[PDB]
Design goal:
Thioestr_dom (chains A, C); 139 residues; alpha+beta; binds 4-hydroxybenzyl coenzyme A; 1,4-dihydroxy-2-naphthoyl-CoA thioesterase activity (chains A, C); 41% strand; homotetramer; 18% helix; 2 helices; Thiol Ester Dehydrase, Chain A
Chain lengths: 139, 140, 139, 140
Amino acid sequence: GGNLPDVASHYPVAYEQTLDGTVGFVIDEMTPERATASVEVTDTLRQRWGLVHGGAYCALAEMLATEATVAVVHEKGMMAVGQSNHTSFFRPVKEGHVRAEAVRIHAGSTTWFWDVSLRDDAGRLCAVSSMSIAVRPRR
Amino acid sequence: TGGNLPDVASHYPVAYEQTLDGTVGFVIDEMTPERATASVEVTDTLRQRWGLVHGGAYCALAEMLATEATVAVVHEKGMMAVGQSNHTSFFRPVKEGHVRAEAVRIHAGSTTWFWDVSLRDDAGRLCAVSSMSIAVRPRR
Amino acid sequence: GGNLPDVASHYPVAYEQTLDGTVGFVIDEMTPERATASVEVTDTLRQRWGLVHGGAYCALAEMLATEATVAVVHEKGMMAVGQSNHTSFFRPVKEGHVRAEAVRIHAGSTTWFWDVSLRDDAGRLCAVSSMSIAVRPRR
Amino acid sequence: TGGNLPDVASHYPVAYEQTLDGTVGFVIDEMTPERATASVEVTDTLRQRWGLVHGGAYCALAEMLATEATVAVVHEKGMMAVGQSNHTSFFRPVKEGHVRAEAVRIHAGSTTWFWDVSLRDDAGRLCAVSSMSIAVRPRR
Ligand SMILES: CC(C)(COP(=O)(O)OP(=O)(O)OC[C@H]1O[C@@H](n2cnc3c(N)ncnc32)[C@H](O)[C@@H]1OP(=O)(O)O)[C@@H](O)C(=O)NCCC(=O)NCCSCc1ccc(O)cc1
Ligand SMILES: CC(C)(COP(=O)(O)OP(=O)(O)OC[C@H]1O[C@@H](n2cnc3c(N)ncnc32)[C@H](O)[C@@H]1OP(=O)(O)O)[C@@H](O)C(=O)NCCC(=O)NCCSCc1ccc(O)cc1
Ligand SMILES: CC(C)(COP(=O)(O)OP(=O)(O)OC[C@H]1O[C@@H](n2cnc3c(N)ncnc32)[C@H](O)[C@@H]1OP(=O)(O)O)[C@@H](O)C(=O)NCCC(=O)NCCSCc1ccc(O)cc1
Ligand SMILES: CC(C)(COP(=O)(O)OP(=O)(O)OC[C@H]1O[C@@H](n2cnc3c(N)ncnc32)[C@H](O)[C@@H]1OP(=O)(O)O)[C@@H](O)C(=O)NCCC(=O)NCCSCc1ccc(O)cc1
């Protein structure tokens, strides 16, 4: 759909109805150590002033780092959810696309950490996200 | 005023209902120079595939609230305000109801304002917090 | 010594030899939900430019939030260590004292979170720290 | 040059050996506009009562490194540089040896520089990371 990891037979919310499907996030590559995703800029991703909403970068990074963790851990009986999301903004984006690259830097038993880079169509670094993902056994 | 955001301009590039904010339904309640509140009714549009409120939704609500709260004061002074850092920490998920946010200003420097935002559930539990650092600069 | 919680019979490093005792951190009050500490500014707390080192605020906050967690959890078979320390600086300090107040905002099963405020002798907010403390069973 | 910090001034308010940096023994190794390294030998002065390197020690090493690395370039340009945000995340403790830090510049704006700092052990493992946001302003 958004090309999210297929790890379960049923999902509570269909992609098109989720926040992710509504703004248009799509996973591109995915491996245990690195994943990418992107989104086309539309007014649905912007704030009233015409720039891509800061929350959009946050959300792309959160989905990308978390889903990339899920991809590995789901099949191991674990649940993966974001515990901390620290996004820093360097340059705005008015149009085009937002591309994210998440690089795994730590995979502990209870926490995985990913560095996410958010770039524009020109390849410029527009924002970064330090994603801390909690890993716990499913209930 | 579509989601009750501060009327500081005659015109805006994107209408409320078309923005991310309008799409997910964020609405500002109170707004003062030192404190602001807003909320959103949870619907699937606010959730991730697993059925919970998306982490990014809390980050966005906090971001919009703190920034707009800064804009309410500085716009007229000829400044622009945009977030420079958003650090959101998640304590408990939200599956349904509303997400209620309260932003309290803790520092108002000449170049940066800082707000502590608490995000609660209908039962009043602290579900997430966001430390928002807002850059303040003069418009071009 | 530094008035740290007395929870064990032996400690690997004596207060006076630790980083805390070397810069002079002292716990004032301590309860499960709130704790305070302070330090006199000396050159040992400063950087070459004469201001209190940013790392000093970080360290005060980290010791204070962690030790306050230890105070409750130690006796329960758990270990408490900092997992994330996010310190933001609003105003420098050149002399006097640094006073910290840590307020517990979340006490989960595996994570405790504290908001730490760092003030000067005039009571001004000089910095803040969001301390995320991991709680795990002792080995 | 006491701990090999950038010589950008004739005189400094506090001598190396007297500062926090000198007391704990931080030493700068390489230093360029886009990348800097430093290290410290672990001793009790770097530890907490439980025998591990104090979290605050990593935060301080990262802080000093990123800031001084910014100072090396901007001082001569009449700017002052001070950290505005230090976010350090801890992955694995260090009990002894050294702590080695590498700061990589990722953004150099007109008012903020941002450095990613990695803190490793003697075995090269990633023990902590720090996101350092440095404010750049003109001196008074
Ligand atoms: C935060 C925590 C526990 C999270 O675990 P994780 O990310 O899931 O990683 P992990 O569980 O796979 O284990 C990584 C390593 O952490 C340590 N660790 C993890 N869990 C434990 C535990 N229950 N007991 C002891 N060490 C542990 C071990 O060194 C472990 O490596 P190993 O399994 O190969 O022996 C782990 O990353 C960590 O220990 N990071 C270091 C925390 C740190 O050193 N903070 C600074 C020290 S406390 C500050 C302080 C200051 C003043 C005071 O007076 C008191 C405290
Ligand atoms: C980040 C910064 C500059 C941003 O300004 P702001 O948030 O907009 O607030 P503001 O502009 O209204 O000014 C607040 C205070 O900051 C200081 N400040 C601001 N701009 C400047 C400046 N250009 N020059 C000197 N002090 C300044 C002043 O004390 C000011 O109080 P004042 O205006 O009443 O004199 C301000 O919040 C600040 O200075 N925070 C303190 C930063 C700090 O002390 N970091 C720790 C020291 S650096 C670590 C280090 C370690 C080892 C080394 O070898 C070197 C460095
Ligand atoms: C991070 C974590 C697990 C840490 O646990 P803690 O701080 O030690 O707190 P805690 O263990 O005492 O439990 C607090 C609550 O968290 C939830 N929780 C904790 N552990 C679990 C678990 N193993 N399974 C399910 N829920 C859990 C429960 O609601 C629990 O409350 P309860 O025990 O009364 O039922 C917990 O604080 C938490 O669940 N916070 C909410 C995390 C969150 O909602 N992040 C956003 C959702 S994921 C983003 C995403 C975006 C797009 C995608 O496509 C996928 C994911
Ligand atoms: C934070 C800030 C201003 C600091 O400047 P800096 O780090 O020193 O970098 P810089 O000064 O060299 O400038 C970098 C770029 O920032 C933008 N910028 C900087 N200063 C300004 C300014 N005064 N006016 C407009 N754009 C500016 C420009 O695009 C500039 O590129 P350019 O100089 O080539 O034109 C800059 O990094 C930045 O703009 N980051 C993007 C902030 C952002 O886009 N946050 C998300 C949007 S706000 C969320 C929101 C949500 C809902 C609402 O209802 C309202 C707001």
